[PDB]
Amino acid sequence: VRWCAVNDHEASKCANFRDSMKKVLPEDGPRIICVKKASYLDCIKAIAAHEADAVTLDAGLVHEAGLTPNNLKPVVAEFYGSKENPKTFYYAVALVKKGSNFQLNELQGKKSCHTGLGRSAGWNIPIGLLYCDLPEPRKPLEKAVASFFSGSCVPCADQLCQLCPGCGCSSSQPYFGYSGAFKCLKDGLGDVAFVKQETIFENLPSKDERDQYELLCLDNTRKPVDEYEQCHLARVPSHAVVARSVDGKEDLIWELLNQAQEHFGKDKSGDFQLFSSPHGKNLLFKDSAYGFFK
Ligand SMILES: [Fe+3]
Numbered sequence: 244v245r246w247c248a249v250n251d252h253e254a255s256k257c258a259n260f261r262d263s264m265k266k267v268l269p270e271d272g273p274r275i276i277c278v279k280k281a282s283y284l285d286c287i288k289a290i291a292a293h294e295a296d297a298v299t300l301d302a303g304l305v306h307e308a309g310l311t312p313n314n315l316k317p318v319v320a321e322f323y324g325s326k327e328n329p330k331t332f333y334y335a336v337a338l339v340k341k342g343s344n345f346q347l348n349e350l351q352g353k354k355s356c357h358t359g360l361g362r363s364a365g366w367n368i369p370i371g372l373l374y375c376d377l378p379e380p381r382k383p384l385e386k387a388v389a390s391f392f393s394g395s396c397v398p399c400a401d402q403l404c405q406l407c408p409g410c411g412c413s414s415s416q417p418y419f420g421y422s423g424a425f426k427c428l429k430d431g432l433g434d435v436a437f438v439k440q441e442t443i444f445e446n447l448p449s450k451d452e453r454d455q456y457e458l459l460c461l462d463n464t465r466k467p468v469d470e471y472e473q474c475h476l477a478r479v480p481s482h483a484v485v486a487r488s489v490d491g492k493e494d495l496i497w498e499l500l501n502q503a504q505e506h507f508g509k510d511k512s513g514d515f516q517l518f519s520s521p522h523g524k525n526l527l528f529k530d531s532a533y534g535f536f537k
Contacts, residue, residue, distance in 0.1 A: 244492055244499050245276040247286035247295035250413050252522040254279040260527065263515035267506045273499040282399060282412050290315055296492050299528055301362040302480040317483035318493050319500050321532035326509060331536065334475035335364035337459035338443060339434035347459045353433030354394030354406065356424040363479035365424060369437045372476060396427045406431050422524040440471040441531045482529055500535050509533050
């Protein structure tokens with residue numbers, strides 16, 4: 244199994260993932276090969292091209308990855324709540340800054356932050372919520388959305404890279420993932436950051452600073468970031484790892500993943516550690532993950 248690492252920081256974690264498993268997995272056990280590819284769909288073409296074997300995509304990404312004449316399929320899925328009460332999904336939430344007296348109503352001429360183009364909480368869900376209203380010339384969605392906010396950081400797009408000129412993927416700073424959309428909000432975003440619900444607590448273990456932001460709700464109202472089950476834009480399926488439909492290394496892939504979660508799972512400090520890393524935030528898997536269901 245040749246895991247596809249999306250650029251430098253991920254490449255580094257993969258490197259870590261590689262050698263530890265080499266210390267645990269039988270005198271063989273998959274024993275990975277870190278393939279690096281600047282972007283995710285880059286990793287998609289790589290897998291299909293038989294250049295790679297796997298990657299963990301957002302579920303909006305798992306979707307477009309099923310596109311064409313034979314594209315990939317989900318094989319392993321992460322499950323976010325506990326070990327006690329797993330859970331195969333999360334919530335999209337619109338995170339904003341306390342006191343910007345604007346509601347989901349008036350996103351109007353505001354600047355916003357996203358995770359990336361075509362992801363669940365970062366784009367699919369908020370735009371779904373938002374068009375109709377979006378400028379008629381709704382030709383391109385990207386273009387009515389350009390036309391509708393007035394500053395945005397939508398990584399991996401191409402325009403709306405006004406807050407992260409170039410719209411890159413992970414070596415992008417005040418932009419890119421969850422992590423980075425939220426960083427976009429901490430300065431720069433007309434207090435709109437479309438994330439996941441577990442994002443503020445990842446970044447902020449301080450209640451006081453966390454009392455500095457709120458959520459935007461359908462029920463046209465702002466609320467404390469602690470009660471997101473009551474203010475959350477929508478529910479979303481969950482990140483899965485895709486492997487080719489035919490001839491992928493499915494059972495191998497799950498062989499890897501399932502033994503690498505026993506060592507290196509949620510509760511353990513095996514130098515390695517699956518669901519967190521020093522090279523930054525959500526590399527190879529999401530930090531919020533707890534494990535893997537098949
Ligand atoms: Fe996601």
